[model samples]
Target: MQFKVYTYKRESRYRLFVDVQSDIIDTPGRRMVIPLASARLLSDKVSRELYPVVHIGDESWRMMTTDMASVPVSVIGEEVADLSHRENDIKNAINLMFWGI
Candidate 1:
């Protein structure tokens, strides 16, 4: 599902990611993800439209849209949460990040 949050354990650490790309492309069997990092660590210089804040389990996180990447289907781990409602804002961020729109 598009906008689902997932985590993959790499180097023994859990890396959080958002399923930003749709299955139209994902049907080819890979997921393009935007990494989620601690919002507290983010600097004020960051643009909220490009790096929107997200809520997960009572915690706020920063969506690292510019750092999006694709991973093999098998590397996708636990289902964290469904962020489909944030789709508009998320896509806006991606659009600005990649297309300057």
Candidate 2:
């Protein structure tokens, strides 16, 4: 159960992500990802700091707490950023969703 961080690039915008394999979650996908989205876009409706958030470009991006997805391994690209320092933030976010903080 290894956790890895990766950055996804669109035409102009970039997305931040953390790769969580099924070995840890025991789900039905080859790869499970916690896709991160822009915090400024989500902060108004969602609680802040509950998930891991990072700065990118000129904005802030927060880990998608309720938007976990299962995808093929091929979709994930090479590591762009290492979020090992934020492991607690990642784990706390996931845990807070399922359990009490």
Candidate 3:
């Protein structure tokens, strides 16, 4: 199935948030919270990258950034966001808890 992801960014803060549709993950027996921490980030891995990075809790992150608008939002593909902390890791697990995968 196709999914639409949302990406919000604040250049000054070097942070962004990704919002994915709840349908793909939310199954009949499974549910996902899309944790505030577990979302992966997207980065160019090079210095002076115009694109922004995400900061969750304390650590910084870079994952998939999506924009359904006519203009380009950020330079990133649609991929699961990556988190930096252990607590954040749990977010992914929680997201997949219902799917049993």
Candidate 4:
């Protein structure tokens, strides 16, 4: 699956633009025009300097799923599919990006 992502600056924070298709297996998918806020605080487990971010393609989807040891993360474009389909992939990516110990 392919997608387009971009970043736009807001007065207070950054916004990530994600464009993607809408469907995955049996799960109904929708294009997440999510305006993710920048990560303000870090967990003790996280690497201090590197603000863990997910670039769907170009935009940075920062670690908004900070509540979990792992999380579901992804981006979308024009295809019809669930962007966050690979649970294991997302978990590994987030862990490595944030913790990477």
Q: Estimate the TM-score of every prediction.
A: 0.89, 0.67, 0.22, 0.28
The sequence of per-residue lDDT tens digits that candidate 1 reaches over residues 1-101 is: 68999987675322799998776764566878888988999998999999999899799889988888888888888998989888989989999986895
Residue range 1-101, candidate 2, lDDT tens digits? 34566755443243656775535466543567788777766656566556666664466778786777665655566776556666677777778877975
Which numbered prediction scores highest in TM-score against the true structure? 1
Model 2: CA > 4 A from native: 1-3, 7-14, 22-29, 56-59
Tens-place lDDT per residue, model 3, 4-70, is: 2233333423223343334445344322122122224333463212223445447654432222122
Name the candidate that leads on lDDT.
1
Q: Candidate 4: where is the Cα deviation over 4 Å?
A: 1-3, 9-12, 20-31, 36-41, 44-52, 55-61, 65-101
lDDT per residue, candidate 4, 1-101, as tens digits? 22334443334243443332233522344333333344444345754323344544444345443332211234222332233543444455446656876
Winner by lDDT between candidate 2 and candidate 1: 1
Model 1 ranges with Cα > 4 A deviation:
12-14
| RMSD per model, one decimal | 1.8, 4.1, 13.0, 9.0
lDDT of 1: 0.85
Clash pairs for candidate 1: none
Q: Lowest summed-lDDT stretch of 10 residues in model 3?
A: 30-39
Measured with C-alpha atoms, the lDDT of residue 51 in candidate 1 is: 96
Better model by TM-score: candidate 2 vs candidate 4: 2
Whole-model lDDT, model 3: 0.33
